[PDB]
């Protein structure tokens, strides 16, 4: 920042990704070409909308986001060859959960075992699917570094895979992690970490807390949570989270997320439940968790709830690394592979090295 | 407002952002409270600044050796010494770290030419914390070349800019000319604080001298690159926000003068890379700038990250949260996950350039 001007929209309410001096200029140029450098448009729903209207809107927004991320995601392929296979498992309640299993070509149960990432994709726990091109690309790029990556096709609160409120998606992620943990020799894996971004960061964090609650925490060796979407407080502007106003309408408007909270928790009864919104965890909830990495984006309205959770994990005694990825809007290092490849692959390499460090 | 912008009495020990493990270690070291003011400042005579730096060197070496003096790398490492000649005829010692069994007949490994910190004024490549760092990097599968460059003060003094820079450049050129003999593929400059300055400036100098193609990348940690610690510009709020977090800026203002006694290089990018023009940076190879959150130097590092991007350089920018200046380079017993996250990040970057 600068001593006479607070950053972002705290210092200049008209600022956008396109005019913020902090934006990586390659990302700013790509967003400008896509029409997404200006402040995000006003959504037709908000936290005052009825749940059914929030569900309907989310189901419509899913296609728009999938189109954008499909463009960014599907223009290339990993530098090392990767195999992808599908497996269907049974969730605790009897539903079928599809898993996309990515691994280096030639990896078998007879190879030397590789570290494993159980990947929980973003979309606010409400929209997007593991089969989407950006998430398939991400899992394959991780696999190409020498990993087995398991993409969980969990139930969503809305959209094509809806409509399943909390805790459906969490249970699917947890059951997928338990299946991976019970199939280490068949998968040819050494260690298991949870990782995902935004809503998937929430799910990766919450899955690990659920493992603690259910007594199988020992199966999870670590968590790499990117730009976690974990407070649920997007309707308001808690003083504790200035980034919500500093970077509002940078890619995401906070009214949109306030509306997308409702499909996840239609009754609102889980607003302070740490399994739904990990930001609300107590120190006792976080005690004993395995090592964490929290990686936030600089120009992201969610930045400060991720950093707050990093600090609480440390206060609870969890081994935690905290990283800001500069120059990026929300989750940009997960998708803009053609525009900021060095940033994208820096994050891929960081996740992979962390996974290896846990084996 | 964070840190001392919001509470002028705040220190590393009371800042809510400090990693509590690091805060406890600093408390035990007497370094959690606001750093002491030095007996010299930027208005002191050059001779007094040199004398102060020379006196302080041994105390800092003892402290940093405590942190990097108990553990050894998980993988075995060999260290050998080589002495080369600088452009001016002086002898430059090199400490070469590599995995045990690595030879010119092995498959070649990526190389890091490491330029240590100390404000370009004090500390040596032989210090235990820097030897430990180079060995931990080598243990990941790297050849690491520690440059024993001339300093502006202390045991290796007294040599102002550009002596140390020329030594780092000449060492990098020697490495680039001995790739088969070292068993190395690619080469990346890396260092922290004053060593971040030297790694950045060595690469800019390679562009000016026509050998830039030899350097495949730069990983610059918490770079000490503005030289503006006496005056604290508005554009660098961290200078106030985190002042006396480990370092008081009067101390660094005093340590500027041995490097540039006349002040005539205050805006020279080879002395202080923060002052680079876009033209100075055009065409440089990929960079990573990694700053510390609770570091008065944070904002000049981030400003340079943004300038590299504006110049068209592929640049990744990272904040290491919860850390004071260069903590992820030394406090391995206290925050090993942070320390090794950085070691792994540097090594992965080096491999990514091969």
The rounded distance, in Å, linking the Cα atoms of B232 and A238 is: 32
The rounded distance, in Å, linking the Cα atoms of A164 and A158 is: 7
Residue in chain A nearest B314 by alpha carbon: A342
Is residue B75 a contact partner of residue B139, using CB atoms and an 8 Å limit? yes
- A4 touches B: beta carbon within 8 Å: yes
Query: In chain A, helix, strand, coil percent, each to 5?
Result: 40, 20, 40
- A132 touches B: beta carbon within 8 Å: no
Is residue A224 a contact partner of residue A295, using CB atoms and an 8 Å limit? yes
| Interface touch B321/A343, C-beta < 8 Å | no
Q: H/E element holding A313?
A: helix A303-315
- Extract the tokens encoding A20: 């913020």
| Interface touch A323/B320, C-beta < 8 Å | yes
- A293 touches B: beta carbon within 8 Å: yes
**Of B243, B180, B191, nearest in space to B220 by CA:** B191
**Helix, strand, or coil (residue A332):** helix
Residue in chain A nearest B236 by alpha carbon: A2
**Of A92, A25, A37, nearest in space to A251 by CA:** A37
Buried b (16+ CB within 10 A) or exposed e, B98-123: bbeebeeeeebbbbbbbbbbbbbbbb
The rounded distance, in Å, linking the Cα atoms of B147 and B126 is: 9
Q: Alpha carbon A217 to chain centroid distance?
A: 20
Question: Which sign, positive or negative, has the C-alpha torsion B235, B236, B241, B244?
Answer: negative
Q: What are the structural domain ranges in chain A?
A: 1-359
Residue labelled with tokens 């350039």? B353
| Interface touch A322/B320, C-beta < 8 Å | yes
Is residue B223 a contact partner of residue B289, using CB atoms and an 8 Å limit? yes
What lies within 8 Å, CB to CB, of A30 at 6+ separation is A336, A339
Residue in chain A nearest B17 by alpha carbon: A311
SS3 for chain B is CCHHHHCCCCCCCCCCCCCHHHHHHHHHHCCCCCCCCCCCCCCCCHHHHHHHHHHHHHHHHHHHHHHCCCCCCCCCEEEEEEEEECCCCCEEEEEEEEECCCCCCCCCEEEEEEECCCCCCCCCCCCHHHHHHHHHHHHCCCEEEEEECCCCCHHHCCCCCCHHHHHHHHHHHHHHCCHHHHCEEEEEEEEECHHHHHHHHHHHHHHHHCCHHHCCEEEEECCCCCCCCCCCCCCCCHHHHCCCECECHHHHHHHHHHHCCCCCCCCCCCCCHHHCCHHHHCCCCCEEEEEEEECCCHHHHHHHHHHHHHCCCCEEEEEEEEEECCHHHCCCCCCHHHHHHHHHHHHHHHHHCC
- B202 touches A: beta carbon within 8 Å: no
Min Cα–Cα distance to chain B from A108, Å = 25
Q: Kindly provide the resolution of this structure in angstroms, with one decimal.
A: 1.8
| Interface touch A21/B320, C-beta < 8 Å | no
**Is B30 buried (19+), middle (13-18) or exposed (0-12) by CB count in 10 A?**
exposed
Is residue B148 a contact partner of residue B124, using CB atoms and an 8 Å limit? yes
Give the CATH number of domain B1-354; options: 3.40.50.300, 3.30.420.40, 3.20.19.10, 3.40.50.1820.
Answer: 3.40.50.1820
- A94 touches B: beta carbon within 8 Å: no
The rounded distance, in Å, linking the Cα atoms of A146 and A111 is: 12
The rounded distance, in Å, linking the Cα atoms of B259 and B119 is: 8
**Helix, strand, or coil (residue A256):** helix
- Interface probe for A, chosen from B110, B348, B353 (most Cβ of A below 10 Å), is B348
Q: H/E element holding A9?
A: helix A8-11
| Interface touch B340/A354, C-beta < 8 Å | no
**Helix, strand, or coil (residue A17):** coil
Q: Please state which CATH class domain A1-359 belongs to.
A: alpha beta
Question: Residue A323: which of B288, B309, B319 has the nearest Cβ?
Answer: B319
A–B CB contacts, 8 A cutoff, strictly below? 93
Residue by residue, DSSP assigns A132-172 as: SHHHHHHHHHHHHTT-EEEEEE---SSGGG----TTHHHHH
Contacts A332 to B, Cβ<8 Å: none
Residue B51 CB: number of other CB atoms within 10 A? 16
- Which neighbouring-strand residues pair with A320? A292
Is residue B222 a contact partner of residue B326, using CB atoms and an 8 Å limit? yes
Contacts A306 to B, Cβ<8 Å: none
The rounded distance, in Å, linking the Cα atoms of A224 and A193 is: 7
Experimental method used, please?
Answer: X-ray
CA distances from A86 to A89, A130, A169 (A): 10, 11, 19
- Extract the tokens encoding A161: 């895979």
- A239 touches B: beta carbon within 8 Å: no
Question: What distance separates the 2 farthest-apart alpha carbons in chain A?
Answer: 62
Residue in chain B nearest A356 by alpha carbon: B344
Min Cα–Cα distance to chain B from A130, Å = 27
- Interface probe for B, chosen from A145, A322, A338, A345 (most Cβ of B below 10 Å), is A322
The rounded distance, in Å, linking the Cα atoms of A346 and A334 is: 10
Residue labelled with tokens 């728009």? A64
Residue A35 CB: number of other CB atoms within 10 A? 8
Question: What distance separates the 2 farthest-apart alpha carbons in chain B?
Answer: 59
Question: Which sign, positive or negative, has the C-alpha torsion A271, A274, A277, A281?
Answer: positive
Task: End-to-end CA distance of chain A: give it in Å, rounded.
Answer: 40
The rounded distance, in Å, linking the Cα atoms of B341 and A348 is: 13
The rounded distance, in Å, linking the Cα atoms of B312 and B318 is: 18
- B87 touches A: beta carbon within 8 Å: no
């Amino acid at each position: 920042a600068t001593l006479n001007q607070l950053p972002g929209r705290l210092g200049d309410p008209s600022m956008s990704l396109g005019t913020d001096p902090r934006t990586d200029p390659r990302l700013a140029a790509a967003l400008t070409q896509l029409g997404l450098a200006d402040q995000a448009a006003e959504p037709p729903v908000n936290a005052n909308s009825e749940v059914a209207d929030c569900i309907a809107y989310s189901t419509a927004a899913e296609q728009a986001w999938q189109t954008l991320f499909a463009m960014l995601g599907s223009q290339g392929e990993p530098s090392n060859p990767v195999d992808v296979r599908e497996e269907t498992i049974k969730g605790r309640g009897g539903n079928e959960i599809k898993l996309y299993i990515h691994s280096p070509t030639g990896h078998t149960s007879d190879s030397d075992p590789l570290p494993c990432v159980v990947h929980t994709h973003g979309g606010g726990m409400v929209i997007l699917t593991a089969a989407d091109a950006n998430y398939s690309r991400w899992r394959s790029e991780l696999a190409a570094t020498g990993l087995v990556v398991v993409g969980v096709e969990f139930r969503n609160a809305a959209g094509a895979l809806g409509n399943h409120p909390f805790p459906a998606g969490l249970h699917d992620c947890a059951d997928a992690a338990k299946w991976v943990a019970s199939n280490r020799e068949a998968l040819g894996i050494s260690t298991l970490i949870m990782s995902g971004e935004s809503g998937g960061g929430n799910l990766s964090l919450a899955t690990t807390m659920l493992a603690k609650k259910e007594g199988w925490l020992e199966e999870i060796a670590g968590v790499y949570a990117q730009c976690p979407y974990i407070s649920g407080l997007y309707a308001s502007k808690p003083e504790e989270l200035p980034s919500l106003l500093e970077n509002d309408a940078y890619f995401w408007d906070m009214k949109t997320m306030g509306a997308m909270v409702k499909p996840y928790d239609p009754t609102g009864e889980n607003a302070s439940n740490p399994l739904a919104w990990p930001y609300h965890a107590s120190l006792e909830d976080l005690a004993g968790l395995p090592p964490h990495v929290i990686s936030v984006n600089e120009l992201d309205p969610l930045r400060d709830e991720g950093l707050a959770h990093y600090r609480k994990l440390l206060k609870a005694g969890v081994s935690t690394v905290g990283r800001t990825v500069h120059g990026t809007c929300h989750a940009a290092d997960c998708s803009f592979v053609d525009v900021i490849p060095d940033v994208y692959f820096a994050t891929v390499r960081d996740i992979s090295a962390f996974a290896y460090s846990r084996a």
